[PDB]
Amino acid sequence: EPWAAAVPPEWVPIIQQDIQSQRKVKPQPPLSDAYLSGMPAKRRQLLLSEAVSRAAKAAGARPLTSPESLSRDLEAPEVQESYRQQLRSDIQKRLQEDP
Amino acid sequence: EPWAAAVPPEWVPIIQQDIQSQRKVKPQPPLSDAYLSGMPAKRRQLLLSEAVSRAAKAAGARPLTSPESLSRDLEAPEVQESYRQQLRSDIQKRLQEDP
Amino acid sequence: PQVWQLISKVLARHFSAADASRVLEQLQRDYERSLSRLTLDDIERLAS
Amino acid sequence: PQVWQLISKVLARHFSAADASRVLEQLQRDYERSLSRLTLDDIERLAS
Amino acid sequence: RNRGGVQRVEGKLRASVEKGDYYEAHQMYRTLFFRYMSQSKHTEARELMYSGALLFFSHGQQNSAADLSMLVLESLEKAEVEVADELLENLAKVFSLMDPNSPERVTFVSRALKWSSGGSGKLGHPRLHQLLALTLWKEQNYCESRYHFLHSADGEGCANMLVEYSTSRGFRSEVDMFVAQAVLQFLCLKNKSSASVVFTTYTQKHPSIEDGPPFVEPLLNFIWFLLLAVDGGKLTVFTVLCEQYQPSLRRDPMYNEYLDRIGQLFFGVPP
Amino acid sequence: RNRGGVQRVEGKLRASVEKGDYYEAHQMYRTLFFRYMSQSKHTEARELMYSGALLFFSHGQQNSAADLSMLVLESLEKAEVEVADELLENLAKVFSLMDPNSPERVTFVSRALKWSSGGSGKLGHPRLHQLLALTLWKEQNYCESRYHFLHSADGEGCANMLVEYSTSRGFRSEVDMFVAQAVLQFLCLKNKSSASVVFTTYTQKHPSIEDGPPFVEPLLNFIWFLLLAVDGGKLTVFTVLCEQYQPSLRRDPMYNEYLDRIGQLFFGVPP
Amino acid sequence: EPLEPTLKNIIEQKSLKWIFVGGKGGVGKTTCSCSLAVQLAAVRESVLIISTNPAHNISDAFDQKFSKVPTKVKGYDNLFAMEIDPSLGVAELPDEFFEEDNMLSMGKKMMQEAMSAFPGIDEAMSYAEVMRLVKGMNFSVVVFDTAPTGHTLRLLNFPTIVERGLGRLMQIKNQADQLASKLEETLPVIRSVSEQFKDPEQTTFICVCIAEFLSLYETERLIQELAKCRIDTHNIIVNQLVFPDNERPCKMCEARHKIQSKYLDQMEDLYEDFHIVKLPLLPHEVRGADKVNTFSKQLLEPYSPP
Amino acid sequence: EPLEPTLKNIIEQKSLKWIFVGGKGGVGKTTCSCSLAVQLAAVRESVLIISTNPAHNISDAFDQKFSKVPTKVKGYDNLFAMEIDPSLGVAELPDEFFEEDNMLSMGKKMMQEAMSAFPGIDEAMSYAEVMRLVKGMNFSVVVFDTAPTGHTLRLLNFPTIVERGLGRLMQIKNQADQLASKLEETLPVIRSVSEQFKDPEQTTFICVCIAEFLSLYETERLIQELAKCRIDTHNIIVNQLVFPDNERPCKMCEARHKIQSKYLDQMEDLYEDFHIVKLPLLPHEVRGADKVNTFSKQLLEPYSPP
Ligand SMILES: Nc1ncnc2c1ncn2[C@@H]1O[C@H](COP(=O)(O)OP(=O)(O)OP(=O)(O)O)[C@@H](O)[C@H]1O
Ligand SMILES: Nc1ncnc2c1ncn2[C@@H]1O[C@H](COP(=O)(O)OP(=O)(O)OP(=O)(O)O)[C@@H](O)[C@H]1O
Ligand SMILES: [Mg+2]
Ligand SMILES: [Mg+2]
Ligand SMILES: [Zn+2]
Incomplete structure (x- = not known):
């Protein structure tokens, strides 16, 4: 290949292999905070009501009655507990993917 | 005159007289501080060395040797006393014009 | 039976049908991305 | 005999002939204007 | 018993004034003023402060009297006392007793004018401006007196003082100008x-x-x-x-x- | 007689330390430090402050020892003491004895690094960076230790601690990344x-x-x-x-x- | 008939959070504040004491140095002490991996040294800490070893003027975006501190003074200033009193007692509706935890001579 | 062998102009400053005393109220007193002859109330007055009833930091013309005040303290801070001492004397090269011109008990 002209010849094989692998490697997952701490960077949803409000704002959805009425209707009762319970299960599920 | 059209007729004579006088009156002299105090305005030469320095600056005259040497040469001796003496006489002279 | 049905029922009155569906898809997106960007610190925060 | 002659003598060495004459006329102007704008407060300041 | 403390304080102030301890009496006056104002007795506090200021003026305690006059102005401001001719006369008299070179006169004048018809004009009733200007004129402070006349509503006294000022400090060529x-x-x-x-x-x-x-x-x-x-x-x-x-x-x-x-x-x- | 006061103060400090009056001893240490510095006895003051800081550390007087260490840094700065390996070791030891969560460690580290080769680099001799990083590593403060390694000149310890940090807090997919x-x-x-x-x-x-x-x-x-x-x-x-x-x-x-x-x-x- | 000459009201008012101890210099602000904090620690779950005075003495009073971050006070499990740091935030450790642009680092630094050198910073720093505490709410109550009357009043006025200026800025906001976000974030806490400082049930001022002309009238002026600020204050700590004994009278103690009795009668007449708690001049140094505890006991229990 | 325990050096140093009296609160800054001013008035042609402390007590000390402009002190012909005014320049009387543009009047006002409300203003105002005095030079010497150690040090540091900032501005001037002219006019006076405050022969600091742990170590900290500021200080006023009498000993006076003797020995050992002048605790209020004069006499003449 053209780039092989400049680099020492014995470097070419490995690089080629890397290239063939690099087009196949699944992208980098989220970085652990441990690794992020080394980086100089520091620019790496609260409750279902706040989540839905953020969703409406991102979608620009106008509430019909009101957002305050929406928040007051639920008030995090037992029936809605499921949501956070779901969260637990979801995160519990993730514990299987990275044991 | 045209301006006489608007003003009441009996005003015209006096004004005319004033006009004929106004073109003749010598301009207003400097105003006394007493009168200036009433005005809301407050934007109404120290020694011969400072006077000459101000004169040179206004005329943009470059000193040949130096201004400090000029100041040191005199140092306000008896011979130069005349200047301030002259001032006195000058101001004394003014005392005759406004007795 | 699920948070999705409760949210749909509430939005049926607090938002229009099109707005409710858009908000639902928007939140599904946010949830999916939060799952894609989950880390140990996030798990610790959930525990707290 | 007069401040003018003393100033001319000093400027003959501290300034050029043209510069000396310009400074002299400039100061004569300043003096004349100061006389034209003399007031009682100015007299009081002189007394001080 | 609760009201007894103020009465005892008043008696102590009277005794201190009798003894000539003028500064202590000034402090006691301040305390009494604050106590009365806390009780909403605005009129009584104002009268007490006026009397104390006059008393201190009589004895030459200029700074104490000025402070008590400022307290009088504070009472007038806080109680929103409606402007009245008698109050303006009292304020003018208090201002007159002050020392012309002291800034206390400037501060007192500013505060009194602001209180007097603070809604608009900075005039109060020009009666106050007239009184201050007359006091300055008797003091031969022509500049401030003329300014107050300008903000006053008395033209006869203004003309008389203008005549006097032009004759004294004015020039021959400025007689009309003024x-x-x-x-x-x-x-x-x-x-x-x-x-x-x-x-x-x-x-x-x-x-x-x-x-x-x-x-x-x-x-x-x-x-x-x-x-x-x-x-x-x-x-x-x-x-x-x-x-x-x-x-x-x-x-x-x-x-x-x-x-x-x-x-x-x-x-x-x-x- | 002029020198007698300092000697008596030193004796009083010794007595106070014996009695366990640690705060009074800290104040006496400050006074002795200032007196010695006023006499240009920079080395003696630095030694005294180092000894006192170590003594206070031994007894758990963390804040007093930190203040005396800051005074040691002040002496080093004022006397322009040339950077030396022994001084860097002493500073690292003093920093180690401090409490990790206290900001005093941050301030001490900043000041020591600034003094050490203050002309350029903020490194001193990286020996100081190496020592601070090793102390943090033994404390398992991987972030600060890694930073100091980055500003240090010891790559072997840096590699070892990177291995440990990746194994402990790192992920399977980040082993090379680190x-x-x-x-x-x-x-x-x-x-x-x-x-x-x-x-x-x-x-x-x-x-x-x-x-x-x-x-x-x-x-x-x-x-x-x-x-x-x-x-x-x-x-x-x-x-x-x-x-x-x-x-x-x-x-x-x-x-x-x-x-x-x-x-x-x-x-x-x-x- | 009169209000009890004890700080029992302060302890009983469990809702009280911010407590300020102030008065003329040398009257015993530090010692009285330490005693009050010690008494509160015996009741409240946790109590903090902050030395806003740039000349901190709580370290001297407790014979135990305190840093600029709250630290456990020796001998107590729920008592913490701190000294306000006039110095601004220390410079962060450089990364210097990228271009070493001075625009940010050098400019921020110079701003920080300049601000630290200016006087007002002291009070400002204290105010900043207050904000932090409102954000934290870590301690149940916090006492202040405030500076003398003048600067203490300046500090107590600072929240209201800052809130008014912030409201003005908001009303003329952007007439940058990160700055606006920070301003919006800060407004709630500034409003909360301003409201709390003006709420009698949330805060109060302890006026500590000695029975003397200067101290008495400085206390009076401070009380009037607080009333202007609408800060509640209903108790005064008279300190360094002298109680002569008939066993062996001495002229010094007798004359001092006469003077202090005159001014204490003046205070009693002047300060109805206040808890005037009287503290004697102990013959021993009030320093160390045990001495301060003993002194606080008589602070809460009215003193009665032999 | 030791330096004489008298302020005779202060009086003899006729070149001295600026004198600062400071220390821990309540140690007697006001009274000692008044006494020193009284003594100086008997020698210098004219002497001023300025109460930079926002809680002014010179009015209380002399039993004669003083305005914000120097006023003759009752009983003396060449003694003047003044209290620094935190409030800024009062608004000038309106002319309102032309359009009532609020841009100037309202903006200046709001700036002035805001600045007056900020804490540092106090010290700033004092500094401003100092500038004025340097411009005036009306009084031969001026004494300062400074605030406690903290704010006093802030004020004393203010000139140097202001001068440095002004130099920076000049070096980046116009990088408006009336502003530049004002800056050029102000630089000479600021430089002069900075130089004078750092000149031992032109100024000095009087450290007044009491024989106690807190006061002693606050004085030590202030002395070190002054040394940092390079402000000369070679005399300390120990005040409120107690001298027991064998005629009728009492426990209070005896224990206080023991404590004060311990700390006075500590001071003597610590403060060589200083004029340690010792003042007793008088049994009468030190207020009024006559009392202050009598107290100053023993201030200058070393006190020796019966
Ligand atoms: N009741 C008392 N008995 C004996 N000594 C006391 C008493 N109250 C205070 N003191 C001592 O008097 C001195 C002044 O008291 P303290 O230091 O508490 O004053 P402060 O108001 O905190 O002062 P500053 O305003 O300067 O900070 C200290 O030595 C203190 O120990
Ligand atoms: N030697 C003394 N004998 C008797 N009383 C004294 C003595 N020195 C001071 N006092 C009194 O002690 C109190 C405190 O003194 P002073 O008011 O002068 O303190 P200060 O340092 O000016 O205080 P602050 O810093 O609060 O302004 C005052 O009542 C003063 O009259
Ligand atoms: Mg204190
Ligand atoms: Mg004082
Ligand atoms: Zn006694």
């Missing part, structure tokens, strides 16, 4: 009647001014015609008078901008 | 030898890394080739390596700008 300025300033404050009366009185009383509406001085004739036009309200007359008398009006440059206000105020000239 | 970052950062600080040694040691010691220059991980091969090119100094090689390995370099975005520095620093790339 009154003209004053008149313009009066008109710059919408007080046309004050301008008319002051001009009349100054012309009538000043020895150097020959009595009669047709004055020899062009400026006086201009001022009289301007007053008449302002009464009429015709802009063309104002423009004609300004143009024809330009040489005399140029004697004092401010006149020009003064005129710029007059046409705006009495002839509808846009700004 | 070292790569470190290497780049080393090269971002012109310490190419440190980069080479740390990469060698980390590759050799990490169990998840198969020993050998031809590593399975593309990123490790890229880093090795980049080190070789930086040794060579050819810009074309750097560009080729950056371009071909873009998919792996994109794993950590900062790598990109890190590379932007490398070419500027080791290959003459204009900014």
Whole structure:
């Protein structure tokens, strides 16, 4: 290949292999905070009501009655507990993917 | 005159007289501080060395040797006393014009 | 039976049908991305 | 005999002939204007 | 028992005043003032502070009396006491007893004027301005007295003091100038009647001014015609008078901008 | 007699320390320090403050010992004491005895680094950075320890601690990432030898890394080739390596700008 | 008939959070504040004491140095002490991986040294800490070893003027975006501190003074200033009193007692509706935890001579 | 052998102009400053005393209220007193002859109330007055009833930091013309005040303290801070001492004397090269011109008990 002209010849094989692998490697997952701490960077949803409000704002959805009425209707009762319970299960599920 | 059209007729004579006088009156002299105090305005030469320095600056005259040497040469001796003496006489002279 | 049905029922009155569906898809997106960007610190925060 | 002659003598060495004459006329102007704008407060300041 | 402390404090203040401990009495006066105000006894506190200020003035305790007068002003402000002639007279008397060179007079005048008709004008009832100006005139503080006259509503005293001021500190060539300025300033404050009366009185009383509406001085004739036009309200007359008398009006440059206000105020000239 | 006061003060300090009045002894130490410095006895004051700080550390008087250590730093700054290995060791020991969560450690570290080779680099002799990093590592403060290593000149300990940190808090998919970052950062600080040694040691010691220059991980091969090119100094090689390995370099975005520095620093790339 | 000469009201008012101890210099602000904090620690779950005075003495009073971050006070499990740091935030450790642009680092630094050198910073720093505490709410109550009357009043006025200026800025906001976000974030806490400082049930001021002309009238002036600020204050700590004994009278103690009795009668007449708690001049140094505890006991229990 | 325990050096140093009296609160800064001013008035042609402390007590000390402008002190012909005014320049009487533009009047006002409300203003105002005095030079010497150690040190540091900032501005001037002219006019006076405050022969600091742990170590900290500021200080006023009498000993006076003797020995050992002048605790209030004069006499003449 053209780039092989400049680099020492014995470097070419490995690089080629890397290239063939690099087009196949699944992208980098989220970085652990441990690794992020080394980086100089520091620019790496609260409750279902706040989540839905953020969703409406991102979608620009106008509430019909009101957002305050929406928040007051639920008030995090037992029936809605499921949501956070779901969260637990979801995160519990993730514990299987990275044991 | 045209301006006489608007003003009441009996005003015209006096004004005319004033006009004929106004073109003749010598301009207003400097105003006394007493009168200036009433005005809301407050934007109404120290020694011969400072006077000459101000004169040179206004005329943009470059000193040949130096201004400090000029100041040191005199140092306000008896011979130069005349200047301030002259001032006195000058101001004394003014005392005759406004007795 | 699920948070999705409760949210749909509430939005049926607090938002229009099109707005409710858009908000639902928007939140599904946010949830999916939060799952894609989950880390140990996030798990610790959930525990707290 | 007069401040003018003393100033001319000093400027003959501290300034050029043209510069000396310009400074002299400039100061004569300043003096004349100061006389034209003399007031009682100015007299009081002189007394001080 | 709760009310006993204030009574005992008042008795102690009386004893201290008798003993001549003037500073301690001043502090006790401050404490009594604050206690009374906390009880909403605004009138009693004001009377006490006025009496104490007068007493301290009598004994030469200038700073203490000034502080108590400031407390009187504070009481008037806090209680929103409606402006009254008697209160203005009291404030003027208190200001008179002060020392002219002290800034306390400046602060007291500013605060009193602000309290007096604080809604608009910074005038109160000009009666206060008139009283302060008269006190300054008796003190021969012509500048401040003239300013207060300008903000007052008494033109006769203003004309008399202008005559005196021009005669004493004025010049031969400024005799008319003075009154003209004053008149313009009066008109710059919408007080046309004050301008008319002051001009009349100054012309009538000043020895150097020959009595009669047709004055020899062009400026006086201009001022009289301007007053008449302002009464009429015709802009063309104002423009004609300004143009024809330009040489005399140029004697004092401010006149020009003064005129710029007059046409705006009495002839509808846009700004 | 003039010198007697200081001697009596020293005796009183000894008595107070014996009695256990630790705060009074701290104040007496401050006074003695100031007196000695006023006499230009910089070395004696520094020794006294070091001894007192150690003594207060032994008894748990953390704040007093920290203040005396700050005074030691002040003495070093004022006397312009030339940086020496023994002084750096003393400062590192003093910093170690402090409480990790206290800001006093941050302030002491900043001041010591500034004093140590204050002319340039904020490094002193990296021996100080190495000592602070080792102390933090024994304290398992991996972030600060890694930072100091980055500003240190010891790559073997840096590689060992990087292995430990990745094993403990790192992820399976980041094993190479860590070292790569470190290497780049080393090269971002012109310490190419440190980069080479740390990469060698980390590759050799990490169990998840198969020993050998031809590593399975593309990123490790890229880093090795980049080190070789930086040794060579050819810009074309750097560009080729950056371009071909873009998919792996994109794993950590900062790598990109890190590379932007490398070419500027080791290959003459204009900014 | 009169209000009890004890701080029992302060302890009983469990809702009280911010407590300020102030008065003329040298009257015993530090010692009285330490005693009050010690008494509160015996009741409240946790109590903090902050030395806003730039010349901190709580370290001297407790014979135990305290840093700029709250630290456990020796001998107590729920008592913490701190000294306000006039110095601004220390410079962060440089990364210097990228171009060493001075625009940010050098400019921020110079701003920080300049601000630290200016006087007002002291009070400002204290105010900043207050904000932090409102954000934290870590301690149940916090006592202040405030500076003398003047600067203490300046500090107590600071929240209201800052809130008014912030409201003005908001009303003329952007007439940058990160700055606006920070301003919006800060407004709630500034409003909360301003409201709390003006709420009698949330805060109060302890006026500590000695029975003397200067101290008495400085206390009076401070009380009036607080009333202007609408800060509640209903108790005064008279300190360093002298109680002569008939066993062996001495002229010094007798005359001092006469003077202090005159001014204490003056205070009693002047300060109805206040808890005037009287503290004697102990013959021993009030320093160390045990001495302060003993002194606080008589602070809460009215003192009665032999 | 030791330096004489008298302020005779202060009086003899006729070149001295600026004198600062400071220390821990309540140690007697006001009274000692008044006494020193009284003594100086008997020698210098004219002497001023300025109460920079926002809680002014010179009015209390002399039993004669003083305005914000120097006023003759009752009983003396060449002694003047003043209290620094935190409030800024009062608004000038309006002319309102022309358009009532709020841009100037309202903006200046709001700036002035805001600045007056900020804490540092106090010290700033004092500094401003100092500038004025340097411009005036009306009084031969001026004494300062400074605030406690903290704010006093802030004020004393203010000139140097202001001068440095002004120099920076000049070096980046116009990088408006009336502003530049004002800056050029102000630089000479600021430089002069900075130089004078750092000149031992032109100024000095009087450290007044009591024989106690807190006061002693606050004085030590202030002395070190002054040394940092390079402000000369070579005399300390120990005040409120107690001298027991064998005629009728009492426990209070005896224990206080023991404590004060311990700390006075500590001071003597610590403060060589200083004029340690010892003042007793008088049994009468030190207020009024006559009392202050009598107290100053023993201030200058070393006190020796019966
Ligand atoms: N009741 C008391 N008995 C004996 N000594 C006391 C008493 N109260 C205070 N003191 C001592 O008097 C001195 C002044 O008291 P303290 O230091 O508490 O004052 P402060 O108001 O905190 O002062 P500053 O305003 O300067 O900070 C200290 O030595 C203190 O120990
Ligand atoms: N030697 C003394 N004998 C008797 N009373 C004294 C003595 N020195 C001071 N006092 C009194 O002690 C109190 C405190 O003194 P002073 O008011 O002078 O303190 P200060 O340092 O000016 O205080 P602050 O810093 O609060 O302004 C005052 O009542 C003063 O009259
Ligand atoms: Mg204190
Ligand atoms: Mg004082
Ligand atoms: Zn006794």
